[PDB]
Amino acid sequence: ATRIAILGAGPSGMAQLRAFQSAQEKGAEIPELVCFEKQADWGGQWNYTWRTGLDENGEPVHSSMYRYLWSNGPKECLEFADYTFDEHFGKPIASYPPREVLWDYIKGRVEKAGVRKYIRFNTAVRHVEFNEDSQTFTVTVQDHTTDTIYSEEFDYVVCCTGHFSTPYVPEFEGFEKFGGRILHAHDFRDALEFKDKTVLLVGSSYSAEDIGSQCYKYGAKKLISCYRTAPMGYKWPENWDERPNLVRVDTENAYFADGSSEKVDAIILCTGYIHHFPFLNDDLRLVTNNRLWPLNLYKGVVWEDNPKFFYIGMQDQWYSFNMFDAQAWYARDVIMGRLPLPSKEEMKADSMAWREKELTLVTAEEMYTYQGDYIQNLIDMTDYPSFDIPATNKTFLEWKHHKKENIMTFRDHSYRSLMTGTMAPKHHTPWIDALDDSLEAYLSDK
Amino acid sequence: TRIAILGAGPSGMAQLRAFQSAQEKGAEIPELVCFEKQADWGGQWNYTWRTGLDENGEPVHSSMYRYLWSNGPKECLEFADYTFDEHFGKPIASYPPREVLWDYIKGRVEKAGVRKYIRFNTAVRHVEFNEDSQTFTVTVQDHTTDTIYSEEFDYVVCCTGHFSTPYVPEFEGFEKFGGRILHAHDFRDALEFKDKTVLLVGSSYSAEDIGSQCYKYGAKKLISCYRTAPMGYKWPENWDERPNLVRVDTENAYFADGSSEKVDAIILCTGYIHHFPFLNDDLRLVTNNRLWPLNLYKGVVWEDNPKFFYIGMQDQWYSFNMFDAQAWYARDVIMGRLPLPSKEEMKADSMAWREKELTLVTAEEMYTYQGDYIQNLIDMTDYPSFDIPATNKTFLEWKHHKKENIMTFRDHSYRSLMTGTMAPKHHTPWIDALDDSLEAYLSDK
Ligand SMILES: Cc1cc2nc3c(=O)[nH]c(=O)nc-3n(C[C@H](O)[C@H](O)[C@H](O)COP(=O)(O)OP(=O)(O)OC[C@H]3O[C@@H](n4cnc5c(N)ncnc54)[C@H](O)[C@@H]3O)c2cc1C
Distances, alpha carbon B361 to alpha carbons A74, B190, B364, B365, B367, in Å:
63, 33, 8, 7, 11
Beta-bridge partners for A198? A222
**Rounded Cα distance, A444 and A128, in Å:** 46
**Is A70 close to ligand 1, i.e. is its CB under 6 Å away?**
no
Beta-strand relationship, A246-249 and A253-256: antiparallel
Distance B68 CA to ligand 1 centre (A): 37
Beta-strand relationship, A32-36 and B180-183: unpaired
CA neighbor of A5 nearest in space, from A139, A145, A151: A139
Distances, alpha carbon A231 to alpha carbons A169, A243, A244, A401, in Å:
22, 10, 9, 16
Cβ separation A56–B168 shorter than 8 A: yes
In this complex, the residue of B139, B183, B192 whose CB is nearest that of residue A181 is B192
Beta-bridge partners for A369? none
Beta-bridge partners for B254? B247, B260
Resolution value (Å, 1 decimal): 2.0
- Closest-approach residue (CA) in chain A for B56: A168
- Closest-approach residue (CA) in chain A for B164: A58
Residues composing chain B: 445
Distances, alpha carbon A229 to alpha carbons A204, A295, A446, B55, in Å:
7, 24, 41, 21
Distances, alpha carbon B391 to alpha carbons B364, B372, B418, in Å:
11, 12, 10
Whole-number CA gyration radius for chain A: 22
**Rounded Cα distance, B53 and B366, in Å:** 35
A254: three-class secondary structure by DSSP:
strand
Cβ separation B59–A54 shorter than 8 A: yes
- Residue ranges, comma separated, of all CATH 3.50.50.60 domains in chain B are 1-169+270-445, 170-269
DSSP state of B421: P
Of A6, A161, A415, which is best to mutate to test ligand 1, by the most ligand atoms within 8 angstroms of its C-beta? Answer: A161
Please say whether the dihedral angle defined by the alpha carbons of residues B291, B326, B68 and B430, taken in this order, is positive or negative.
Answer: positive
A289 contacts A136 by C-beta, under 8 angstroms:
no
Residue ranges of E strands in B172-214: 180-183, 197-201
**Is A322 close to ligand 1, i.e. is its CB under 6 Å away?**
no
Which amino acid does the sequence have at B27? A
**Rounded Cα distance, B137 and B134, in Å:** 10
Name which of B51, B137, B141, B279 to mutate to probe chain A: the one with the most chain A Cβ atoms within 10 A of its Cβ: B51
H helix or E strand, kind and range, residue B4: strand B2-6
CB atoms closer than 10 angstroms to residue B2: 16
**Is A98 close to ligand 1, i.e. is its CB under 6 Å away?**
no
Decide: residue A337, CB within 10 A, 0-12 exposed, 13-18 middle, 19+ buried. Answer: exposed
Distances, alpha carbon B124 to alpha carbons A155, B69, B140, B428, in Å:
27, 30, 5, 43
Question: How many pairs of residues across A and B have Cβ atoms under 8 Å apart?
Answer: 98
Cα angle B386, B391, B394; round to 5: 155
B5 contacts B155 by C-beta, under 8 angstroms:
no
Annotated binding site of A: 12, 37, 39, 45-46, 62, 70, 72, 125, 204-207, 228-229, 245, 290, 316-317, 320, 368, 411
Cβ separation B186–A52 shorter than 8 A: yes
Cβ separation B277–A171 shorter than 8 A: no
**Rounded Cα distance, A375 and A395, in Å:** 16
CB atoms closer than 10 angstroms to residue A73: 22
Half-sphere exposure of A154 (CA within 13 A, CB side): 29
Beta-bridge partners for B140? B124, B149
Cα angle A211, A215, A221; round to 5: 140
- Residue ranges, comma separated, of all CATH 3.50.50.60 domains in chain A are 1-170+271-446, 171-270
DSSP state of A118: G
DSSP state of B318: S
Cα angle A223, A225, A228; round to 5: 170
B141 contacts B147 by C-beta, under 8 angstroms:
yes
Give the dihedral of Cα atoms A392, A396, A398, A401; nearest 10 deg: -170
B33 contacts B127 by C-beta, under 8 angstroms:
no
Distances, alpha carbon B8 to alpha carbons B46, B141, B157, B197, B272, in Å:
11, 16, 11, 38, 20
Specify the fold of B170-269.
FAD/NAD(P)-binding domain (3.50.50)
B367: three-class secondary structure by DSSP:
helix
User: What is the b/e burial string over A400-427, where b = at least 16 CB atoms within 10 angstroms of the residue's CB?
Assistant: bebbeeebbebbbbebbbbbeebebeeb
Half-sphere exposure of A213 (CA within 13 A, CB side): 25
Distance A197 CA to ligand 1 centre (A): 30
Give counts: helices (H), strands (E), chain B. 9, 18
Name the region of B336 (left: φ>0; alpha: ψ -120 to 50; beta: rest). Answer: left
End-to-end CA distance of chain A: 54
**Rounded Cα distance, B284 and B122, in Å:** 20
Distance of CA A54 to the CA centre of its chain: 20
Cβ separation B49–A142 shorter than 8 A: no
CA neighbor of B303 nearest in space, from B358, B342, B356, B351: B342
- The percent of chain A in helix, strand and coil, each rounded to the nearest 5, is 30, 20, 50
Whole-number CA gyration radius for chain B: 22
Distance from CA of A103 to the nearest CA of B (A): 16
Find chain B residues with C-beta within 8 A of A289's C-beta. none
A372 contacts A319 by C-beta, under 8 angstroms:
yes
**Rounded Cα distance, A337 and B110, in Å:** 61
Distance A117 CA to ligand 1 centre (A): 21
Which amino acid does the sequence have at A199? V
Distance A163 CA to ligand 1 centre (A): 7
Name the region of A68 (left: φ>0; alpha: ψ -120 to 50; beta: rest). Answer: left
Distances, alpha carbon B395 to alpha carbons B73, B212, B366, B390, B418, in Å:
7, 20, 11, 9, 15
**Is A410 close to ligand 1, i.e. is its CB under 6 Å away?**
no
CATH classification code of A1-170+271-446: 3.50.50.60
DSSP state of B272: B
Distance from CA of A190 to the nearest CA of B (A): 7
A389 contacts A320 by C-beta, under 8 angstroms:
no
Give counts: helices (H), strands (E), chain A. 9, 18
**Is A140 close to ligand 1, i.e. is its CB under 6 Å away?**
no
**Rounded Cα distance, B139 and A403, in Å:** 48
Atom of ligand 1 minimally distant from the CA of A14 = 25
Give the dihedral of Cα atoms A253, A256, A262, A268; nearest 10 deg: -70
B2: three-class secondary structure by DSSP:
strand
Q: Which residues, at least 6 apart from A104, have a Cβ–Cβ distance to it below 8 Å?
A: A88, A439
Experimental method: X-ray
CA neighbor of A428 nearest in space, from A92, A79, A100: A92
- Closest-approach residue (CA) in chain A for B163: A58
Of A12, A18, A39, A45, which is best to mutate to test ligand 1, by the most ligand atoms within 8 angstroms of its C-beta? Answer: A45
Find chain A residues with C-beta within 8 A of B183's C-beta. 53
Specify the fold of A171-270.
FAD/NAD(P)-binding domain (3.50.50)
Distance of CA B235 to the CA centre of its chain: 26
User: What is the b/e burial string over A217-254, where b = at least 16 CB atoms within 10 angstroms of the residue's CB?
Assistant: bbebebbbbbbeeeeeebebeeebeebeebeebeeeeb
Specify the fold of B1-169+270-445.
FAD/NAD(P)-binding domain (3.50.50)
The A32-36 sheet, strands edge to edge: A119-120, A32-36, A3-7, A156-159, A309-311, A302-303, A297-298
CA neighbor of A321 nearest in space, from A23, A85, A37: A85
